[PDB]
């Protein structure tokens, strides 16, 4: 029984970012947490595009690539949805995917902007985050885009479109008391926003017994999940990976004996 006893302080919480501090953790746990924010927090994104008509100046898989990157609301439906690989249905079904439609024709002289607002989902829980709107393609008069897409569950470790973060700022030891980074000329380096030093001194005095214990986070959200949901989803997902691992380890230990 040598578990840490982390404490959490949330400094800033908006609709886009959550700023918080974790204290009394190992650097490995703090790094694995940010590393799960990016790669192992599931969301719903378009991963299956079928284009019926595309007269735009962008080729078919150019459009599909853009549709995959469009963030979709995933706050609570993502937990309910199953992985299409795990689901027992056919290619797709409502329990493992969300169907999308896009049918735009340009007939006016003015350029028609095909945006995420033109994506229509079969489930109100999963919609483009913008509903300015993300531009998919611009249509000239006489050009049309007619496609149907399926959005499925996934996480950033597979493709960056399932990464829910727009930048995870991670920091520790802002005053470099541990000297994990050695400045050739410390006076030349800007103070961290979390620096507690005075203007006169550039580095905190070296701490021989110090260890990384306090970690600063700024988890910005793409929009698919609330920033606080990304953190909670990461903490439960990381716990799930460990609990799943221990179940396998228990079998291996039992199997050997």
Partner 1 sequence: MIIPVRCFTCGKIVGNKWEAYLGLLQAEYTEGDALDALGLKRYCCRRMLLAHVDLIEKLLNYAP
Partner 2 sequence: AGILFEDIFDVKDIDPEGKKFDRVSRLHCESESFKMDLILDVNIQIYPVDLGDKFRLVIASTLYEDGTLDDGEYNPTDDRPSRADQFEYVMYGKVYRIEGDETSTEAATRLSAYVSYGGLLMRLQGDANNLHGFEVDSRVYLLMKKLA
Partner 3 sequence: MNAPPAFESFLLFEGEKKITINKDTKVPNACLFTINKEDHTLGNIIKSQLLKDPQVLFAGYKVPHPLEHKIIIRVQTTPDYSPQEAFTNAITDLISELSLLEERFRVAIKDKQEG
Interface residue list for partner 3 (CB under 8 A): 1-10, 13, 20, 22, 25-29, 31-32, 35-36, 39-40, 85, 157-159, 228, 231-232, 235-236, 238-239, 241-246, 248-250, 252-253, 256
Task: Please identify, using beta-carbon distances, which residue of 23 and 144 lies nearer to partner 3.
Answer: 23
Beta bridge partners of 144: 105
Contact 167, 222 (CB under 8 A): no
Stretch (H or E) spanning 39:
helix 27-39
Distance (Å) of CA 240 to CA 35, 40, 247: 15, 11, 11
Look at residue 208 and give the partner it binds from Zn ion, partner 3, partner 2, none, a contact being a CB closer than 5 to 8 Å depending on partner kind.
partner 2
Alpha-helical runs (H) found in the chain? 27-39, 60-69, 77-80, 227-256
Q: Which two tokens stand for residue 237?
A: 């997902």
Other Cβ atoms less than 10 A from the Cβ of 98: the count is: 26
Task: Please identify, using beta-carbon distances, which residue of 66 and 226 lies nearer to partner 1.
Answer: 66
Strand, helix or coil at 53?
strand
Task: Please identify, using beta-carbon distances, which residue of 47 and 220 lies nearer to partner 1.
Answer: 220
Q: DSSP readout, 208-255? A: TT----EEEEEEEE-SSS-HHHHHHHHHHHHHHHHHHHHHHHHHHHHH
Among 83, 183, 189, 206, binds partner 2 (CB under 8 A): 206
Alpha carbons 76 and 230: distance in angstroms, whole number: 11
Q: Which two tokens stand for residue 68?
A: 């995959």
Q: Say whether residue 208 binds partner 2 (CB under 8 A).
A: yes
222 is in an annotated binding site: no
Look at residue 206 and give the partner it binds from partner 3, partner 2, partner 1, none, a contact being a CB closer than 5 to 8 Å depending on partner kind.
partner 2
Look at residue 69 and give the partner it binds from partner 1, Zn ion, partner 3, none, a contact being a CB closer than 5 to 8 Å depending on partner kind.
partner 1
Annotated binding site for Zn(2+): 87, 89-91, 93-94, 96
- Contact positions toward partner 2, by CB under 8 A? 182, 206, 208
- Contact positions toward partner 1, by CB under 8 A? 55, 57-58, 62, 66, 69-71, 111, 113, 115-116, 129-130, 132-135, 137-138, 140, 142-143, 160, 163, 165-167, 220, 222-223
């Amino acid at each position: 029984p040598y578990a840490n006893q982390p404490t959490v302080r949330i400094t800033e919480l908006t609709d886009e970012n959550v700023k918080f501090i974790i204290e009394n953790t190992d650097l490995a746990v703090a790094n694995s947490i940010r590393r799960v924010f990016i790669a192992e927090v599931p969301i719903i994104a378009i991963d299956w595009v079928q284009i019926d008509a595309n007269s735009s100046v962008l080729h078919d898989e150019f459009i599909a690539h853009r549709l995959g990157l469009i963030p979709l609301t995933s706050d609570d439906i993502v937990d309910k949805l199953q992985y299409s690989r795990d689901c027992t249905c056919e290619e797709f079904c409502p329990e493992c995917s969300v169907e999308f439609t896009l049918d735009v024709r340009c007939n006016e002289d003015q350029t028609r902007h095909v945006t995420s607002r033109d994506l229509i989902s079969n489930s109100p829980r999963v919609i483009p985050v913008t509903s300015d709107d993300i531009l998919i393609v611009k249509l000239r008069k006489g050009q049309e885009l007619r496609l149907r897409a399926y959005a499925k569950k996934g996480f950033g470790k597979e493709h960056a479109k399932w990464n829910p973060t727009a930048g995870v700022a991670f920091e520790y030891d802002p005053d470099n008391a541990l000297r994990h980074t050695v400045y050739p000329k410390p006076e030349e380096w800007p103070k961290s926003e979390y620096s507690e030093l005075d203007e006169d001194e550039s580095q905190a005095p070296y701490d021989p017994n110090g260890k990384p214990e306090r970690f600063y986070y700024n988890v910005e959200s793409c929009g698919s999940l609330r920033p606080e949901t990304i953190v909670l989803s990461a903490l439960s997902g990381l716990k799930k990976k460990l609990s799943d691992l221990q179940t396998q380890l228990s079998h291996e230990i039992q199997s050997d004996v």
